Ligand binder design. Structure first.
Ligand SMILES: CCCCCCCCCCCCCCCCCC(=O)OC[C@H](COP(=O)([O-])OCC(O)COP(=O)([O-])OC[C@@H](COC(=O)CCCCCCCCCCCCCCCCC)OC(=O)CCCCCCCCCCCCCCCCC)OC(=O)CCCCCCCCCCCCCCCCC
Ligand SMILES: CCCCCCCCCCCCCCCCCC(=O)OC[C@H](COP(=O)([O-])OCC[N+](C)(C)C)OC(=O)CCCCCCCCCCCCCCCCC
Ligand SMILES: CCCCCCCCCCCCCCCCCC(=O)OC[C@H](COP(=O)(O)OCCN)OC(=O)CCCCCCCCCCCCCCCCC
Ligand code: SF4
Ligand code: SF4
Lengths: 51, 218, 198, 44, 126, 49, 155, 113, 172
């Protein structure tokens, strides 16, 4: 019987902290795995008014 | 549940301008700007956006230094909300709006001839959820069946009106009176004299209300 | 009927040593299943329920007990068959029921346990479901149920310095004591009560 | 559908542009305007 | 009179809205207070507004097998939070009041007679 | 030890410390604990003393 | 070779996905970038943990069948959206959380032994059998007038 | 002959489902069949709810955002509700002003002869 | 010990010291604890009468140890001494001697611990909790007593005493 892969104790939790995420993403980055997170997407008129 | 439903998806109404029920100005470009704010990651959890910005910097600086909570809410509550006229009802000189169905002080009624309506059927006694009604009956020497005792503990009563609904001759009613405050616990032990005089005093208003209520089904 | 339904039969598949007795009724919701469970397997059954897939997303909705020692049919005594669940209310000293809801299967599950011992002893499940603490405390104080391996056994709703089970049929709704102020002691005391009767 | 656009259950469907303008704000808040204005004014 | 009450209740609810929702003190008093997730929300048998704040979609009116009293054949919205704290519960309660107004309006419409009889010529109401 | 357990390790994450220190329920006991024969508190056997 | 008897493939399952939800609908629940790999890991660990339960017990058989079903379904599906359309049309995070919960039941069932009988079973079965039976009533029973009680006389 | 089932059939009675496939310890394929059936039931029962479960909502959520002094102005539906209320009030007012009077119930002691 | 009776649940002697220096200590037996009780787990089941009797004896010992504290905090020391209160509660227990179901005895021990904790934390009223410490056939010590019915019904039996004094009101 092949040995099962190891599962971390803190793994299987509903959410993760920073070092837990660092454990999970050892080969990759946030953008490559989770995607892009956007704060606000102002329109052209709003951006022009802000400048 | 108990019927069939081949298509559970409720399709949206027709959006064509040709349609009779087309609703222009339903969507407002100035107001409906949710596409701007729907992609914010702050609305979905504890996470932070990939890039912060000077707009957030300016917002935080405005919130932390100017402290608008001391002028926004102060003005907008105080002045405007104080401009509105008052709501108070002057109780000694005005009364709050009631209805002919209002359940107040109990009374025993009479026929227009002066005869008691109550025939001691004890339906009101068994209808009482609080067991507040006690009735004892003897044949009156002329032969009619009348109560020798009919009393209600007003400290047991829950003022529910089940007894006036159960009465088949409209003998026991709940009147419009609510100013029945007493100084002794024994003043709230209502016997037949008290209920009879309550009926003899409040008969016009009770008659008017019952007249309207009777005419309602008709 | 007019909805997707399936029995919770895997529970008795895993627990191979148990008889299966289940009911569905139109007096209940169409997703509500009632089952009979022996008392000596209740803790293990709840352990299985709390963690097994498609059961783990479950919550305990209600808990209570029925004093069936005085249960009698009052009408239609000739319309009872061997399949009626009320047929299990006879000759049985006590009954206990638990009601759960499962979000994955969108189902209601009621479990019934027959207590036939005079001391009314059954294992507690408040170490599995955090609901069961107050619910089981109230049930134990109301019906005299003796819960074993419970987190908290203190009284929940009853008065201090009193031992009684008011929800038993033998108990009269007026109790046995009344509270009065005592002038000779300048404090409240309890006395044997005389009450009005209608 | 009473909760989506162009629903026959809705009654006020004809030209209510004036009422809609009167009852609702006609300008959009733009971030930073108050902050920049107040900070510059305070410094000056 | 119920429709009149609804129209004025919009204004009174907005009046309560603008002293609490955006208040810095209110936010610092309610945000991230009493936070819990769905696991606690299941362990302690939480239902209703608290269950909608923990993130769970649980409304008995909108359930297919558990609905009652005309609710299944109306059209209203229900709200769920994404943080499970006091602020979410407050906002959910305000939005539930608004949706209750909407449901009352829908019921009154369902017991209403809108169309009338028009003259055969000139399409004039009689 | 705290990092192995899963405690917050940053100032920003401390705002959710309770979610990792209190909101996780204790595991229920095994039924073998209930099936024991004796439940006396342990003490040293003083046979040779 | 069957998947459950096939060694865990790190490269096949630990692959980034380009189509993930912006968030789950639940508070304090994080989107898992690689859900299929986690499902395979938990399934293999469940099989290894079940290796200690007796093979003839229905708990082991039922769990092994369910695990095999889940493994086949998640191996045949490469898109997370169709996988989530299976398994209740909800967030896959809830499914993974509940399956991790399934992990501990193996240890909890060793000390409870659902495959072994208990001393109190017989009384429960007897009281089950007693409850269901025909229940006649004392009234509605025919009683005839008894014959005359003849008197006995001593000698 | 005495019972209606085979000695290997453990279904004493089944009125709920009228099943003809007993689950037995000996028959291991029945366990697999039950697992398949239960997973299919899971999918189907979650695929029939009209509000509780929606994968499209999970992937395309719709949010309500507080942005102005008016809570109703942040949602077109509430604005439509307010306009409908005003429309009903105006219709009632014009309909009642057209008639010019209002019948009322007046008390009559002749009712109490 | 994470329990209300744990050896570390004592009130500190001073604000900077649990006891004097060089050592620790505290009183948790004859007085109440420092922290409040938050849970009271079930009694471990007793398989026979010996375990139940041991539980009863230990509960009685705890009650006897806590008597003086209760008498002081409830201002009931003049009605009876500590020994008299112990004897009265022992009379209660003796009236409960005929019990033979160990589970019932465990339930009773749980209830007794609960009522004792209520008494020692001012949850109950002294005039209410004194019903378990009052004498059965003796007057209380804080007031005088009447011996009228002792003089008139001197040698008369119990039946005659209960016959001369009725069992119902006589007006009705
Ligand atoms: C008693 C005093 C107040 C009486 C009037 C009350 C009233 O109507 O209040 C609402 C009224 C309208 O503002 P609002 O309700 O916040 O508008 C929200 C909208 O969504 C529009 O959002 P918005 O943020 O785009 O608002 C437009 C912006 C317009 O601001 C600008 O256009 C900024 C221009 C400068 C931009 C940056 C360059 C700086 C250098 C030049 O308005 C303001 O900045 C309002 C004034 C801010 C406080 C000023 C206090 C002065 C003392 O606000 C005020 O009256 C605030 C006080 C104004 C005092 C007089 C200023 C001259
Ligand atoms: C004296 C009162 C002055 C402010 C009057 C007023 O209504 O201000 C509203 C404005 C509103 O500012 P605001 O931009 O914070 O509010 C609009 C944005 N929402 C509703 C989403 C929060 O308050 C101020 O300008 C701050 C007080 C004056 C500071 C100098
Ligand atoms: C507020 C700023 C303001 O308007 O100040 C008044 C000022 C004119 O006054 P002052 O600068 O004292 O000139 C002598 C005449 N009084 O006004 C001006 O001089 C107008 C231009 C002010 C520019 C600086 C504002 C700060
Ligand atoms: S219900 Fe009416 S008629 Fe009957 S006993 Fe009472 S008052 Fe009399
Ligand atoms: S109103 Fe209700 S509670 Fe009061 S006397 Fe009548 S029946 Fe009884």
């Amino acid at each position: 019987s092949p040995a099962p892969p190891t599962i971390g104790q803190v793994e299987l939790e509903p959410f993760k902290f920073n070092h837990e995420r660092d454990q999970l993403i050892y080969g990759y980055t946030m953008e490559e795995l989770y995607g892009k997170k956007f704060g606000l997407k102002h329109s052209a008129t709003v951006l022009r008014e802000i400048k | 549940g108990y019927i069939q439903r081949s298509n559970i998806h409720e399709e949206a109404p027709n959006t064509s301008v040709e349609a009779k029920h087309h609703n222009k100005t339903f969507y407002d470009p100035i107001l409906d700007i949710d596409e701007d704010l729907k992609d914010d990651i702050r609305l979905y959890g504890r996470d932070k956006p990939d890039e912060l910005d000077f707009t957030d910097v300016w917002e935080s600086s405005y919130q932390n230094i100017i402290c608008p909570e001391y002028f926004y809410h102060f003005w907008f509550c105080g002045i405007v909300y104080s401009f509105e006229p008052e709501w108070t009802i002057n109780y000694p000189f005005e009364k709050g709006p009631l209805s002919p169905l209002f359940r107040g002080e109990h009374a025993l009624r009479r026929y227009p001839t002066g005869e008691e309506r109550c025939i001691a059927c004890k339906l009101c006694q068994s209808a009482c959820p609080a067991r507040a009604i006690t009735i004892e009956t003897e044949p009156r020497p002329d032969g009619s069946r009348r109560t020798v005792r009919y009393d209600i503990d007003m400290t047991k009563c829950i003022y529910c009106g089940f007894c006036q609904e159960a009465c088949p001759v409209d003998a026991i009613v709940e009147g419009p009176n609510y100013e029945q405050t007493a100084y002794l616990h024994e003043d709230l032990f209502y016997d037949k004299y008290k209920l009879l005089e309550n009926g003899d005093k409040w008969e016009p208003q009770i008659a008017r209300n019952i007249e309207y209520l009777i005419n309602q089904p008709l | 009927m007019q909805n997707k339904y399936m029995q919770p039969i895997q529970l008795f598949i895993v627990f191979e040593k148990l008889n299966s007795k289940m009911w569905i009724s139109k007096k209940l919701n169409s997703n509500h299943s009632i089952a009979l469970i022996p008392s000596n397997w209740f803790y293990s059954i709840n352990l299985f329920l709390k963690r097994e897939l498609l059961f783990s997303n479950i919550t305990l909705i209600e808990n209570s007990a029925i004093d069936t020692i005085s249960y009698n049919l009052e009408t239609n005594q000739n319309d009872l068959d061997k399949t009626n669940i009320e047929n299990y209310f006879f000759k049985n000293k006590m009954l206990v029921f638990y009601n759960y809801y499962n979000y994955f299967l969108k189902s209601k599950l009621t479990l019934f346990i027959i207590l036939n011992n005079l001391n009314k002893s059954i294992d507690s499940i408040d170490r599995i479901f955090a609901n069961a603490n107050w619910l089981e405390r109230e049930t134990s104080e109301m019906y005299g149920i003796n819960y074993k391996w419970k987190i908290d056994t203190r009284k929940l709703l009853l008065d201090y310095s009193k031992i009684e089970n008011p929800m038993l049929k033998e108990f009269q709704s007026e109790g046995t004591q009344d509270a009065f102020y005592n002038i000779f002691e300048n404090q409240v005391v309890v006395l044997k009560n005389e009450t009005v009767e209608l | 559908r009473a909760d989506m656009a162009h629903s026959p259950f809705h009654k006020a469907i004809h030209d209510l542009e004036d009422k809609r303008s009167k009852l609702f704000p006609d300008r959009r808040r733009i971030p930073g305007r108050k902050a920049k204005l107040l900070l510059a004014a305070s410094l000056l | 009179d119920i429709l009149e009450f609804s129209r004025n209740f919009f204004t009174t609810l907005n009046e309560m809205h603008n002293v609490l929702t955006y208040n810095k003190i209110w936010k610092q008093r309610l945000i991230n207070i009493g936070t819990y997730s769905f696991q606690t929300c299941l362990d302690y048998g939480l239902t209703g507004v608290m269950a909608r704040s923990c993130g769970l979609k649980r409304d008995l009116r909108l359930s297919k097998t558990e609905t009652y009293a005309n609710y299944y054949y109306l059209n209203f919205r229900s709200y769920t939070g994404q943080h499970g704290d006091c602020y979410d519960r407050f906002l959910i309660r305000m939005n539930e009041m608004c949706e209750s107004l909407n449901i009352v309006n829908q019921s009154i419409n369902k017991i209403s007679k809108f169309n009338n009889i028009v003259s055969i010529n000139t399409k004039k109401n009689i | 030890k705290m990092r192995d357990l899963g405690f917050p390790m940053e100032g920003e994450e401390e705002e959710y410390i309770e979610q990792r220190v209190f909101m996780r329920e204790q595991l229920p006991p095994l039924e073998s604990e209930f099936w024991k024969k004796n439940y006396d508190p342990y003490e040293q056997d003083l046979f040779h003393f | 070779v069957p998947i459950h008897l096939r060694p865990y493939n790190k490269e096949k399952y630990e692959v980034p996905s380009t189509k993930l939800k912006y968030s789950t609908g639940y508070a304090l629940l994080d989107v898992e970038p690689m859900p299929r790999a986690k499902i395979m890991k938990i399934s293999y660990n469940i099989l290894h943990k079940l290796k200690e339960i007796p093979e003839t017990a229905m708990y082991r058989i039922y769990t092994e069948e369910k695990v095999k079903y889940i493994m086949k379904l998640t191996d045949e599906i490469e898109d997370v959206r169709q996988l989530e359309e299976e398994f209740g049309q909800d967030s896959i995070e809830l499914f993974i959380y509940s399956y991790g919960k399934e992990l501990e039941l193996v240890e909890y069932m060793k000390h409870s032994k659902p495959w072994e009988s208990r001393p109190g079973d017989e009384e429960q079965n007897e009281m089950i059998r007693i409850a269901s039976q025909k229940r006649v009533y004392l009234k509605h029973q025919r009683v005839d007038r008894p014959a005359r009680q003849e008197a006995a006389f001593i000698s | 002959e005495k019972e209606k089932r085979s000695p290997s059939n453990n279904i004493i009675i089944d009125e709920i489902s009228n099943s003809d496939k007993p689950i037995t310890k000996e028959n291991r394929e029945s366990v697999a069949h039950h697992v398949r059936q239960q997973f299919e039931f899971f999918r189907e029962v979650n695929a029939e709810e009209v509000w509780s479960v929606s994968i499209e909502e999970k992937y395309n959520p719709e949010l309500y955002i507080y942005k102005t002094y008016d809570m109703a102005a942040d949602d077109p539906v509430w604005r439509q509700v307010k306009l409908d209320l005003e429309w009903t009030f105006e219709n009632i007012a014009e309909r009642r002003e057209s008639l010019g009077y209002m019948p009322t119930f007046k008390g009559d002691p002749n009712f109490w002869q | 010990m994470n329990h209300y009776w744990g050896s570390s649940n004592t009130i500190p002697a001073s604000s900077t010291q649990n006891n004097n220096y060089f050592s620790g200590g505290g009183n948790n037996v004859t007085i109440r604890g420092n922290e409040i009780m938050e849970r009271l787990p079930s009694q471990t089941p007793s398989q026979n009468m010996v375990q139940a009797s041991m539980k009863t004896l230990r509960f009685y010992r705890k009650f006897c140890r806590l008597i003086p504290f209760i008498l002081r905090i409830h201002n009931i020391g003049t009605k009876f001494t500590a020994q008299q209160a112990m004897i009265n509660f022992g009379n209660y227990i003796r009236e409960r001697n005929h019990y033979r179901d160990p589970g019932l005895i465990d339930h009773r021990i749980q209830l007794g611990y609960e009522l004792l904790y209520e008494a020692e934390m001012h949850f109950s009223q002294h005039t209410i909790l004194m019903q378990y410490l009052s004498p059965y056939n003796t007057p209380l010590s804080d007031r005088g007593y009447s011996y009228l019915e002792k003089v008139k019904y001197g040698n008369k039996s119990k039946f005659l005493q209960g016959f001369y004094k009725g069992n119902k009101p006589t007006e009705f």
